[PDB]
Symmetry: C2
Subunit: 140 residues, 2 copies
Protein backbone atom coordinates (compact mmCIF):
# COMPACT_ATOMS: atom_id res chain seq x y z
CA UNK A 1 0.00 0.00 0.00
CA UNK A 2 1.16 3.52 -1.00
CA UNK A 3 0.53 6.63 1.04
CA UNK A 4 1.61 10.01 -0.22
CA UNK A 5 1.89 12.52 2.61
CA UNK A 6 1.66 16.14 1.61
CA UNK A 7 2.33 18.29 4.68
CA UNK A 8 5.02 20.94 4.90
CA UNK A 9 5.50 20.95 8.67
CA UNK A 10 8.90 19.23 8.61
CA UNK A 11 8.08 17.50 11.90
CA UNK A 12 4.54 16.29 11.51
CA UNK A 13 5.27 15.21 7.98
CA UNK A 14 8.28 13.35 9.34
CA UNK A 15 6.44 11.72 12.22
CA UNK A 16 3.83 10.37 9.77
CA UNK A 17 6.37 8.85 7.38
CA UNK A 18 8.08 7.41 10.40
CA UNK A 19 4.89 6.07 12.06
CA UNK A 20 3.01 4.80 9.01
CA UNK A 21 6.15 2.92 8.01
CA UNK A 22 6.06 0.68 11.08
CA UNK A 23 2.51 -0.28 10.16
CA UNK A 24 4.03 -1.41 6.87
CA UNK A 25 3.08 1.29 4.40
CA UNK A 26 5.30 2.50 1.57
CA UNK A 27 5.32 6.24 2.32
CA UNK A 28 6.59 9.13 0.25
CA UNK A 29 6.20 12.75 1.40
CA UNK A 30 6.25 16.22 -0.13
CA UNK A 31 6.79 19.80 1.13
CA UNK A 32 4.77 21.72 -1.42
CA UNK A 33 2.10 21.26 -4.03
CA UNK A 34 4.75 20.86 -6.67
CA UNK A 35 6.69 18.04 -5.10
CA UNK A 36 3.21 16.55 -4.86
CA UNK A 37 2.05 17.07 -8.47
CA UNK A 38 5.42 15.63 -9.55
CA UNK A 39 5.02 12.50 -7.46
CA UNK A 40 1.30 12.12 -8.28
CA UNK A 41 2.22 12.19 -11.96
CA UNK A 42 4.77 9.38 -11.79
CA UNK A 43 3.45 6.89 -9.28
CA UNK A 44 -0.05 5.99 -8.15
CA UNK A 45 -0.95 6.16 -4.47
CA UNK A 46 -3.97 4.51 -2.83
CA UNK A 47 -4.23 7.04 -0.05
CA UNK A 48 -3.07 10.62 0.32
CA UNK A 49 -2.88 12.65 3.50
CA UNK A 50 -3.46 16.22 2.35
CA UNK A 51 -2.56 19.39 4.24
CA UNK A 52 -5.08 22.00 3.23
CA UNK A 53 -2.75 24.99 3.59
CA UNK A 54 0.48 24.76 1.61
CA UNK A 55 2.70 27.73 0.49
CA UNK A 56 2.33 27.54 -3.32
CA UNK A 57 -1.13 26.12 -3.99
CA UNK A 58 -4.35 25.53 -2.09
CA UNK A 59 -5.03 21.98 -0.89
CA UNK A 60 -8.35 21.56 -2.65
CA UNK A 61 -6.70 22.38 -6.02
CA UNK A 62 -4.63 19.23 -5.56
CA UNK A 63 -7.67 17.33 -4.29
CA UNK A 64 -9.62 18.24 -7.39
CA UNK A 65 -6.82 17.20 -9.76
CA UNK A 66 -6.25 13.88 -7.94
CA UNK A 67 -9.92 12.98 -8.15
CA UNK A 68 -10.49 14.40 -11.61
CA UNK A 69 -7.53 12.22 -12.62
CA UNK A 70 -7.17 9.07 -10.53
CA UNK A 71 -10.48 8.65 -8.54
CA UNK A 72 -9.40 5.24 -7.30
CA UNK A 73 -7.18 7.30 -5.04
CA UNK A 74 -8.64 7.93 -1.58
CA UNK A 75 -7.71 11.37 -0.24
CA UNK A 76 -7.87 12.20 3.47
CA UNK A 77 -7.59 15.95 4.08
CA UNK A 78 -5.83 16.82 7.37
CA UNK A 79 -5.75 20.44 8.45
CA UNK A 80 -5.40 22.76 11.40
CA UNK A 81 -6.91 25.54 9.29
CA UNK A 82 -10.36 24.11 8.61
CA UNK A 83 -13.91 25.48 8.51
CA UNK A 84 -17.30 23.80 8.12
CA UNK A 85 -17.65 25.43 4.72
CA UNK A 86 -14.16 24.40 3.65
CA UNK A 87 -14.72 20.89 4.98
CA UNK A 88 -18.05 20.50 3.19
CA UNK A 89 -16.48 21.64 -0.11
CA UNK A 90 -13.71 19.10 0.47
CA UNK A 91 -16.31 16.36 0.89
CA UNK A 92 -18.32 17.56 -2.10
CA UNK A 93 -15.14 17.15 -4.21
CA UNK A 94 -14.75 13.51 -3.23
CA UNK A 95 -12.58 13.33 -0.13
CA UNK A 96 -13.02 10.23 2.01
CA UNK A 97 -12.72 12.17 5.24
CA UNK A 98 -11.53 15.49 6.65
CA UNK A 99 -9.42 15.25 9.78
CA UNK A 100 -8.77 18.23 12.07
CA UNK A 101 -5.34 19.10 13.57
CA UNK A 102 -4.54 18.03 16.18
CA UNK A 103 -5.22 14.46 15.20
CA UNK A 104 -3.83 11.42 16.99
CA UNK A 105 -1.70 9.05 14.87
CA UNK A 106 -3.70 5.95 15.60
CA UNK A 107 -6.76 7.71 14.23
CA UNK A 108 -4.93 8.83 11.08
CA UNK A 109 -4.14 5.10 10.73
CA UNK A 110 -7.76 3.99 11.22
CA UNK A 111 -9.10 6.58 8.78
CA UNK A 112 -6.49 5.40 6.23
CA UNK A 113 -7.64 1.78 6.56
CA UNK A 114 -11.31 2.72 6.34
CA UNK A 115 -10.32 4.77 3.34
CA UNK A 116 -8.89 1.59 1.87
CA UNK A 117 -11.90 -0.54 2.73
CA UNK A 118 -14.13 1.94 0.86
CA UNK A 119 -11.84 2.24 -2.17
CA UNK A 120 -12.25 -1.54 -2.22
CA UNK A 121 -15.98 -2.22 -1.75
CA UNK A 122 -16.62 0.25 -4.52
CA UNK A 123 -14.35 -2.05 -6.58
CA UNK A 124 -16.16 -5.30 -5.76
CA UNK A 125 -19.55 -3.68 -6.53
CA UNK A 126 -18.14 -2.32 -9.75
CA UNK A 127 -17.12 -5.91 -10.53
CA UNK A 128 -20.64 -7.22 -9.83
CA UNK A 129 -22.34 -4.63 -12.04
CA UNK A 130 -20.12 -6.22 -14.71
CA UNK A 131 -20.90 -9.80 -13.53
CA UNK A 132 -24.60 -8.91 -13.33
CA UNK A 133 -25.38 -6.35 -16.10
CA UNK A 134 -22.97 -8.15 -18.40
CA UNK A 135 -22.37 -11.88 -17.78
CA UNK A 136 -25.55 -13.54 -16.42
CA UNK A 137 -27.67 -10.79 -17.99
CA UNK A 138 -26.67 -11.30 -21.62
CA UNK A 139 -29.96 -12.95 -22.66
CA UNK A 140 -28.66 -15.48 -20.16
CA UNK B 1 -41.45 20.77 -6.23
CA UNK B 2 -41.73 20.21 -2.49
CA UNK B 3 -39.81 21.36 0.57
CA UNK B 4 -39.99 19.79 3.99
CA UNK B 5 -38.76 22.19 6.67
CA UNK B 6 -37.72 20.47 9.89
CA UNK B 7 -36.82 23.48 12.11
CA UNK B 8 -38.00 23.73 15.76
CA UNK B 9 -37.76 27.54 15.85
CA UNK B 10 -40.96 29.44 15.08
CA UNK B 11 -38.82 32.26 13.79
CA UNK B 12 -36.60 30.49 11.33
CA UNK B 13 -39.25 27.88 10.50
CA UNK B 14 -41.82 30.55 9.84
CA UNK B 15 -39.41 32.91 8.10
CA UNK B 16 -38.49 29.92 5.91
CA UNK B 17 -42.13 29.11 5.04
CA UNK B 18 -43.00 32.69 4.19
CA UNK B 19 -39.91 32.99 1.96
CA UNK B 20 -40.04 29.70 0.10
CA UNK B 21 -43.66 30.46 -0.80
CA UNK B 22 -43.00 33.68 -2.75
CA UNK B 23 -40.66 31.64 -4.96
CA UNK B 24 -43.49 29.22 -5.69
CA UNK B 25 -42.99 26.11 -3.57
CA UNK B 26 -45.07 23.69 -1.52
CA UNK B 27 -43.46 24.24 1.88
CA UNK B 28 -44.41 22.29 5.01
CA UNK B 29 -42.92 22.86 8.48
CA UNK B 30 -42.32 20.38 11.36
CA UNK B 31 -41.83 21.40 15.02
CA UNK B 32 -40.27 18.15 16.28
CA UNK B 33 -38.92 14.80 15.17
CA UNK B 34 -41.93 12.54 14.71
CA UNK B 35 -43.98 15.34 13.20
CA UNK B 36 -41.47 15.26 10.36
CA UNK B 37 -41.02 11.48 10.52
CA UNK B 38 -44.75 11.12 9.79
CA UNK B 39 -45.02 13.60 6.90
CA UNK B 40 -42.13 11.76 5.24
CA UNK B 41 -43.94 8.48 5.68
CA UNK B 42 -46.97 10.15 4.05
CA UNK B 43 -45.73 12.34 1.19
CA UNK B 44 -42.59 12.81 -0.96
CA UNK B 45 -40.64 16.08 -0.92
CA UNK B 46 -37.95 16.85 -3.46
CA UNK B 47 -35.83 18.76 -0.93
CA UNK B 48 -35.71 18.65 2.86
CA UNK B 49 -34.20 21.38 5.01
CA UNK B 50 -33.22 19.42 8.09
CA UNK B 51 -32.04 21.18 11.23
CA UNK B 52 -29.44 19.39 13.27
CA UNK B 53 -30.53 19.80 16.92
CA UNK B 54 -34.21 19.10 17.61
CA UNK B 55 -35.73 18.47 21.08
CA UNK B 56 -36.56 14.78 20.69
CA UNK B 57 -34.35 13.47 17.88
CA UNK B 58 -30.88 14.24 16.51
CA UNK B 59 -31.43 15.54 12.98
CA UNK B 60 -28.71 13.36 11.45
CA UNK B 61 -30.81 10.33 12.36
CA UNK B 62 -33.63 11.86 10.35
CA UNK B 63 -31.13 12.42 7.54
CA UNK B 64 -30.07 8.78 7.81
CA UNK B 65 -33.71 7.70 7.57
CA UNK B 66 -34.62 9.98 4.63
CA UNK B 67 -31.80 8.43 2.64
CA UNK B 68 -32.22 4.73 3.32
CA UNK B 69 -35.97 5.23 2.70
CA UNK B 70 -36.15 7.58 -0.27
CA UNK B 71 -32.53 8.24 -1.49
CA UNK B 72 -33.82 10.67 -4.14
CA UNK B 73 -34.98 13.28 -1.66
CA UNK B 74 -32.14 15.79 -1.28
CA UNK B 75 -31.38 17.01 2.22
CA UNK B 76 -29.80 20.34 3.10
CA UNK B 77 -28.89 20.45 6.78
CA UNK B 78 -28.91 24.08 7.90
CA UNK B 79 -27.93 24.55 11.54
CA UNK B 80 -26.40 26.82 14.16
CA UNK B 81 -24.90 24.00 16.21
CA UNK B 82 -22.41 22.78 13.60
CA UNK B 83 -18.96 21.25 13.92
CA UNK B 84 -16.65 20.13 11.13
CA UNK B 85 -16.87 16.54 12.31
CA UNK B 86 -20.67 16.65 12.18
CA UNK B 87 -20.71 18.30 8.76
CA UNK B 88 -18.08 15.88 7.45
CA UNK B 89 -20.34 13.16 8.84
CA UNK B 90 -23.62 14.53 7.49
CA UNK B 91 -21.95 14.66 4.07
CA UNK B 92 -20.70 11.08 4.27
CA UNK B 93 -24.33 10.06 4.95
CA UNK B 94 -26.12 11.82 2.11
CA UNK B 95 -26.61 15.56 2.76
CA UNK B 96 -26.28 17.67 -0.36
CA UNK B 97 -24.91 20.59 1.62
CA UNK B 98 -24.48 21.67 5.25
CA UNK B 99 -25.33 25.32 5.82
CA UNK B 100 -24.56 27.35 8.92
CA UNK B 101 -26.77 29.84 10.79
CA UNK B 102 -26.75 32.75 10.17
CA UNK B 103 -27.38 32.21 6.48
CA UNK B 104 -28.98 34.67 4.08
CA UNK B 105 -32.25 33.45 2.53
CA UNK B 106 -30.94 33.89 -1.03
CA UNK B 107 -28.13 31.48 -0.26
CA UNK B 108 -30.54 29.01 1.29
CA UNK B 109 -32.87 29.30 -1.71
CA UNK B 110 -30.10 29.01 -4.25
CA UNK B 111 -28.66 26.05 -2.40
CA UNK B 112 -31.97 24.38 -3.15
CA UNK B 113 -31.97 25.10 -6.88
CA UNK B 114 -28.46 23.63 -7.05
CA UNK B 115 -29.85 20.69 -5.05
CA UNK B 116 -32.40 19.71 -7.66
CA UNK B 117 -30.11 20.41 -10.58
CA UNK B 118 -27.80 17.79 -9.04
CA UNK B 119 -30.88 15.67 -8.20
CA UNK B 120 -31.50 15.61 -11.96
CA UNK B 121 -28.12 14.87 -13.55
CA UNK B 122 -28.52 11.35 -12.20
CA UNK B 123 -31.97 10.58 -13.58
CA UNK B 124 -30.33 11.38 -16.90
CA UNK B 125 -27.42 9.23 -15.75
MG1 LIG C 1 1.25 24.48 7.19
Amino acid sequence: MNVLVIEDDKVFRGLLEEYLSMKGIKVESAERGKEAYKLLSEKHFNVVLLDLLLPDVNGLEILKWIKERSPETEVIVITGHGTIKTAVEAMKMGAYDFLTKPCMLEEIELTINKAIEHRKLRKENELLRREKDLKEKLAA
